[PDB]
Amino acid sequence: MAQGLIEVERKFLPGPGTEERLQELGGTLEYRVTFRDTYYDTPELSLMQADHWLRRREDSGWELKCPGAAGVLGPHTEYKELTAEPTIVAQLCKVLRAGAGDVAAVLGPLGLQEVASFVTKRSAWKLVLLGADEEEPQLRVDLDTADFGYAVGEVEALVHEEAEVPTALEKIHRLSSMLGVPAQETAPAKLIVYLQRFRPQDYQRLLEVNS
């Protein structure tokens, strides 16, 4: 189970020189892929309010991201990636305060409805660091373009235990600086931009309740 359940990440807005600097560091373009995700939430965006993200990826399956360090690390920084459907069901019941063995079965009972569906084109780069001669010596950089035109990058470390997260954060920040990402720069998740575009009243309601 070598990869790890915990995503540590930093989103950014790509520029013309991002891939070249990745290459010059020894990074490689591992693949280019296109994937369709459908996201689910209550009409109140209860999951999004709790920094939970539930999606079913075509030809891949369900995933629930939920914060690994809620209240300690800011949103869009660390997520446990839940893919075993019984764990997803348990965590959804927990967050939403509610006999489903699979996620499809729980949507009705929990009041979860489709809130977005869209396709992303991704260039997945990986950087093996120090020729692999260190702990967790691979960082991923995804360069995504959503079908609505939004371009977003993510520098990502996948680790196994919360105790690895501080070091992962440090390495992601250092790689981010080398790719030319301003320290203060933020970039919204694709789903948030989808809501801005196509469900602007939901996006406004989200801003209001999150404050």
Q: Which residues bind Cl ion (CB under 5 A)?
A: 189-190
55 is in an annotated binding site: yes
Instruction: Give CA separation, 126 vs 57, 107, 201, in Å.
Output: 22, 35, 37
Burial class (CB in 10 A: 0-12, 13-18, 19+), 92: buried
- State the Cα–Cα distance between residues 65 and 169, nearest whole angstrom: 18
Task: Considering the complex, state which of residue 19 and residue 142 has its C-beta at the smaller distance from Cl ion.
Answer: 142
Task: Considering the complex, state which of residue 110 and residue 141 has its C-beta at the smaller distance from Cl ion.
Answer: 141
185 is in an annotated binding site: no
156 is in an annotated binding site: yes
162 is in an annotated binding site: no
- State the Cα–Cα distance between residues 90 and 62, nearest whole angstrom: 14
Minimum distance of Cl ion from residue 190's CB (angstroms): 4
Minimum distance of Cl ion from residue 137's CB (angstroms): 23
Minimum distance of Cl ion from residue 134's CB (angstroms): 26
Minimum distance of Cl ion from residue 152's CB (angstroms): 5
Task: Considering the complex, state which of residue 84 and residue 104 has its C-beta at the smaller distance from Cl ion.
Answer: 84
What is the dihedral angle through the alpha carbons of 49, 56, 40, 113, rounded to the nearest 10 degrees? -170
In the block, residue with structure tokens 């404050």: 211
122 is in an annotated binding site: yes
Binding residues for substrate: 11, 55, 57, 65, 122, 154, 190
